[PDB]
Amino acid sequence: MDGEEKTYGGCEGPDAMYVKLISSDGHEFIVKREHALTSGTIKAMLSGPGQFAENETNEVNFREIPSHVLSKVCMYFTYKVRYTNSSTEIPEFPIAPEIALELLMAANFLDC
Amino acid sequence: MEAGRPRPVLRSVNSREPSQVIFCNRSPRVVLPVWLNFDGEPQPYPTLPPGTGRRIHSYRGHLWLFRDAGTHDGLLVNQTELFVPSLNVDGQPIFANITLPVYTLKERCLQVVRSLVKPENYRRLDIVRSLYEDLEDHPNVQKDLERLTQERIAHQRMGD
Amino acid sequence: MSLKPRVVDFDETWNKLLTTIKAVVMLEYVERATWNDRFSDIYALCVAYPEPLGERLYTETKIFLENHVRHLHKRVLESEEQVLVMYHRYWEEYSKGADYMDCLYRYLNTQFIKKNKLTEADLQYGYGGVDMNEPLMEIGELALDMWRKLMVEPLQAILIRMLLREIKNDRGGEDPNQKVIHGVINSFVHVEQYKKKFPLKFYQEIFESPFLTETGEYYKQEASNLLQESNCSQYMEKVLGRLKDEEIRCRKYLHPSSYTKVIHECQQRMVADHLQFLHAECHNIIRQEKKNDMANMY
Amino acid sequence: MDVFLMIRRHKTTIFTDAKESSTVFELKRIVEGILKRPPDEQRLYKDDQLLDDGKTLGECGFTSQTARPQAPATVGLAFRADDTFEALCIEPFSSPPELPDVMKPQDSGSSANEQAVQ
């Protein structure tokens, strides 16, 4: 609306910009492509399959990770990308005890 | 000396040349400094609070590593696993900056869980089975030494 | 499946996985869904029960790769001088496919094999061609190890020599394509095992050296032929042009490292053995004006 | 200056970033790029409260003191059919499992069995 602005900035953009994650119970997580690049398994998916992957089509399927775990994974991505490349203060990161075993396996799998 | 490399790979060398060092604890943890003697055996030293720094009279070629005092989790010195003093110059004392490493999410979670639950009850938790073994594998300096030794050999290569 | 430790049967999952793995090699289209499924497949295998499927899967992949790359070599060999062409397409599909595997495998690589056979080192197998299982180190390094065996074969002396016969002509034998020649040449570099330094030794010794000597003879015969028929002023322009074509050819066919070696023999073959004749010509050329003649000399 | 958000409606979540002093309207534009539906159809809610485009997000209470990268604020989302609005309904994330004995801190032991331990 007001003052200097750009369409492309403000993190508005087509489907190539954002990557889609599917849970075990089918919940959808939309994250920024840069966030998705932090995990190696996801990074490896998006490099492939990928002889046809220059079609603006991105998806990851989890057959192990449900949404309560996966949300904590997404939160981690937002935090990791935001604080890196600055000297600003970085606080701790919440882990619920119940979730902890599952968050630890999902983290171990994800290569993040 | 004798031909060949005597002693263990990771060990300090008794180089008579002194180096003045100041340890600066840049992290939130209580840091336990460890000096590897000539034998390669880790030796503990007094712990440092997160705000503090301390003067040390080391020698060039001595080996030091740093860990969380309570947890024994790994810490970085000058962004690396091991700190080895070198000759000081006009430079004045050599600084060893202890900083928190950016732990993987999985490892951090392991750390938090470990603090929370007794080891007797790792198995009781309802988490993936594979994690149980991981939890039991707490941080260990000796293990680290073994890993470093292997990495070091890899480091060694022929010259140009 | 789940993160939690499960019970998983090897063979049911491995057949479906094998089907997928085989598509990725030779570049038949793998789906997005299936690709995702594979990451999960390797995971479930690795975590299931006390005894990991991880190590069973490691032996199994190693044997399957060995037989396949070998049998493709024997198929590739079969064609009558379209050997290089199929070697190029198998290498190109493979390059992208091997990049995908390393990627696919990252979890196996990280968690398992934190140690090799550290403690002991064989001298019974570990270097050069053997049918004994190859070291326990990671996927890319493993891939390079299986490949080095293919090459040794008594087929390599005649084939290289015949391939070279076509290439040595820069006229009266035109031309083999840049895509085709290149495909062979980068394969020769690739088909060496993990080293601590430049692979390129194999390429220089097997291809480069018989190629250079033969390239010499073409020029030697051509230069003598022209010296005899034509005069000095037609020779210098034609040899400068013959060099100009050699640079272009080198840039297209070869590796950076040989660009110089190939031209360096030809430039030496045209002038440097004929120089005595050339030195005698030069004095008359300087006495006359002829700016272009002196420039070509210079 | 930045606030970290999650825009949620019925088992879909978008992790997005927005400025603290920017309008509620600006956020609908971010949603349009990804979801590819107009802003006008969309309704954005804060704790089931209708939000207008005269309001900015800092004023709604989505300042960076409560909105963190570790834990973002939730923005409710509704779509419209045409004129008539659907209104909020977010299907939740599955409950995390029961906390096992092992993670509870220690408590006293038990007397040894007669037979060997299995």
Curated annotation (Swiss-Prot), chain A:
Stored CDD domains: BTB_POZ_EloC (cd18321)
Database matches in InterPro entries: ELC1, SKP1-like, SKP1/BTB/POZ_sf, Skp1_comp_POZ
Location of the protein in the cell: Nucleus
Keywords: Host-virus interaction, Nucleus, Transcription, Transcription regulation, Ubl conjugation, Ubl conjugation pathway
Post-translational modification: Ubiquitinated by the DCX(AMBRA1) complex, leading to its degradation by the proteasome.
Positions of transmembrane segments: none
Keyword Flavoprotein: no
Organ and tissue specificity: Overexpressed in prostate cancer cell line PC-3 and breast cancer cell line SK-BR-3.
Record has Ligase as a keyword: no
Gene Ontology molecular function, alphabetical: protein-macromolecule adaptor activity; transcription corepressor binding
Pathway the protein acts in: Protein modification; protein ubiquitination
GO biological process: protein ubiquitination; regulation of transcription by RNA polymerase II; target-directed miRNA degradation; transcription initiation at RNA polymerase II promoter; ubiquitin-dependent protein catabolic process
Quaternary structure annotation from Swiss-Prot or TrEMBL: Heterotrimer of an A (ELOA, ELOA2 or ELOA3P), ELOB and ELOC subunit. The elongin BC complex interacts with EPOP; leading to recruit the elongin BC complex to Polycomb group (PcG) target genes, thereby restricting excessive activity of the PRC2/EED-EZH2 complex. (Microbial infection) Interacts with HIV-1 Vif; forming an active cullin-5-RING E3 ubiquitin-protein ligase complex (ECS complex).
Family stated for the protein in its record: Belongs to the SKP1 family.
Name under which the protein is recorded: Elongin-C
Curated annotation (Swiss-Prot), chain B:
First-to-last residue of the parent protein present: 54 to 213 of 213
Consequence when changing G40C: In PCC and VHLD; type II
Keyword Transcription listed: no
Effect of mutating E17K: In VHLD; type I
Domain of life of the organism encoding this protein: Eukaryota
Recorded consequence of changing L105P: In VHLD; type I-II; abolishes release from chaperonin complex and the interaction with Elongin BC complex
Effect annotated for changing R114Q: In PCC and VHLD; type II; common mutation
Phenotype for R147W: In ECYT2 and VHLD; type I
UniProt effect for mutating V102M: In VHLD; with RCC
Single annotated GO MF: molecular adaptor activity
UniProt keyword Cytoplasm present: yes
Annotated region described as Involved in binding to CCT complex, given as residue ranges: 47-102
Record note on what altering F66L does: In PCC and VHLD; type II
Record annotation: effect of changing L125Q: In VHLD; type II
Protein's UniProt name: von Hippel-Lindau disease tumor suppressor
Effect of L131R: In VHLD; type I
Mutagenesis or variant effect for Y103D: In VHLD; type I
UniProt-reported outcome of changing G40S: In PCC and VHLD; type II
Effect in UniProt of substituting N25H: In VHLD; type I
Effect upon mutating Q43P: In VHLD; type I
Consequence when changing V117F: In VHLD; type II
Swiss-Prot record, chain C:
Gene Ontology biological process terms in this record: G1/S transition of mitotic cell cycle; intrinsic apoptotic signaling pathway; protein ubiquitination; SCF-dependent proteasomal ubiquitin-dependent protein catabolic process; ubiquitin-dependent protein catabolic process via the C-end degron rule pathway
GO molecular function, one term: ubiquitin-protein transferase activity
Compartment(s) of residence: Nucleus
Keywords (A to Z) from UniProt: Acetylation, Host-virus interaction, Isopeptide bond, Nucleus, Phosphoprotein, Ubl conjugation, Ubl conjugation pathway
GO-annotated cellular components: Cul2-RING ubiquitin ligase complex; cytosol; nucleolus; nucleoplasm; SCF ubiquitin ligase complex
Location, primary (coarse class): nucleus
Family stated for the protein in its record: Belongs to the cullin family.
Domain notes: The Cullin neddylation domain restrains the RING domain of RBX1 in the E3 ubiquitin-protein ligase complex; this restraint is removed upon neddylation of the cullin.
Subunit structure, as described in the record: Component of multiple Cul2-RING (CRL2) E3 ubiquitin-protein ligase complexes consisting of CUL2, Elongin BC (ELOB and ELOC), RBX1 and a variable substrate-specific adapter; this complex is also known as ECS (Elongin BC-CUL2/5-SOCS-box protein) complex and may consist of CUL2 or CUL5. Component of a ECS(VHL) or CBC(VHL) complex containing CUL2, RBX1, ELOB, ELOC and VHL. Component of the ECS(MED8) complex with the probable substrate recognition component MED8.
Protein name: Cullin-2
UniProtKB/Swiss-Prot annotation, chain D:
Any one Gene Ontology cellular component term annotated for this protein: Cul5-RING ubiquitin ligase complex
Phosphothreonine modification, residue list: T84
Keywords (A to Z) from UniProt: Acetylation, Host-virus interaction, Nucleus, Phosphoprotein, Transcription, Transcription regulation, Ubl conjugation pathway
Protein's UniProt keywords contain Kinase: no
Subcellular location(s) of the protein: Nucleus
Gene3D superfamilies in UniProt: Phosphatidylinositol 3-kinase Catalytic Subunit, Chain A, domain 1 (3.10.20.90)
Cross-referenced SMART domains: UBQ
Sequence positions bearing Phosphoserine: S108, S111
GO molecular function, one term: transcription corepressor binding
Keyword field contains Nucleus: yes
Protein family per UniProt: Belongs to the Elongin B family.
Protein name, as recorded: Elongin-B
